[PDB]
């Protein structure tokens, strides 16, 4: 019953087309709760979940000031990085940053993170001890040194293991009805002939929360990973998730296959068989 709070930041430059675009988003577990979009007329951090709307003007004003400061730093980052990598002035580039914290079922701190990528590649990351940095580049080593002199890791440590966890516990209680819910997957199988001698067997998991789930097919109780078509878990759009797994079986062997479903919402993992 672990949880987490995570902020996601994306900055994309657009040469000769004005300011870089900046998008910030925040999540509690798999539920998004705030956003900020540099191209929006609002110029404000905005609510994306009903339980966050109760926060007063002091919270919104504060998060707006901070998200604008994040936006500005990434503005600068973009130009600095072109320079470190001596690349053209006219090419669009992307910078990404993510940070947050995880807590266990007891809501105690498990780990913290703060990572940064340039054009989709790891740039610099805070290690798990929250004291050292990983820099897989000569340019990333230059950033590592400035961040070391500024004692940035010590400041992030206080936030990740203190402030970050403090806000996650508050959001978890304020939005308990949504965030502390366990919606077990509604399951069913579909069968479809593909030919005279083969049929498709699809196992469905619908309307579940949280998103974490294991869904597998086995033949005579044996692993069939190679022969299983498994789609990545996807959002229904109403706060729940969906996933399906399928195997092509020779007609008349339906009874040899079993779909297995494991999810926090289920007391006991489920085993289904077309029968």
């Amino acid at each position: 019953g672990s949880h987490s709070m995570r902020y996601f930041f994306t900055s994309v430059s657009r040469p000769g087309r004005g300011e870089p675009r900046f998008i910030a988003v925040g999540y509690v577990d798999d539920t998004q709760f705030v956003r900020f979009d540099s191209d929006a007329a609002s110029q404000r951090m905005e609510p994306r979940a009903p339980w966050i709307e109760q926060e007063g003007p002091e919270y919104w004003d504060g998060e707006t000031r901070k998200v604008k400061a994040h936006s500005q730093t990434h503005r600068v980052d973009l130009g600095t990085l072109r320079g470190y990598y001596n690349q053209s002035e006219a090419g669009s580039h992307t910078v990404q940053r993510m940070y947050g914290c995880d807590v266990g079922s007891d809501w105690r701190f498990l780990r913290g993170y703060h990572q940064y990528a340039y054009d989709g590649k790891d740039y610099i990351a805070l290690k798990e001890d929250l004291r050292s940095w990983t820099a897989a580049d000569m340019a990333a080593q230059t950033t590592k040194h400035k961040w070391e002199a500024a004692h940035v890791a010590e400041q992030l440590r206080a936030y990740l293991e203190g402030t970050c966890v403090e806000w996650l516990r508050r959001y978890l209680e304020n939005g308990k009805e949504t965030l502390q819910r366990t919606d077990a997957p509604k399951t069913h199988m579909t069968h479809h002939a593909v030919s005279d001698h083969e049929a498709t067997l699809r196992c469905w998991a619908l309307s579940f929360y949280p998103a974490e789930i294991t869904l597998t097919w086995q033949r005579d109780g044996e692993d069939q990973t190679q022969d299983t078509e498994l789609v990545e878990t996807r959002p229904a759009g109403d706060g729940t998730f969906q996933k399906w797994a399928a195997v092509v079986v020779p007609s008349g062997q339906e009874q040899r296959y079993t779909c297995h479903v494991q999810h926090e919402g289920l007391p006991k993992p489920l085993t289904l068989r077309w029968e």
Binding site: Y7, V67, T80, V152, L156, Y159, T163, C164
Partner: peptide, 10 residues
């Protein structure tokens, strides 16, 4: 809530 310190330019 967002972090208020430690977000330094690269």
């Amino acid at each position: 809530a967002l972090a208020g310190i430690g977000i330094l330019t690269v």
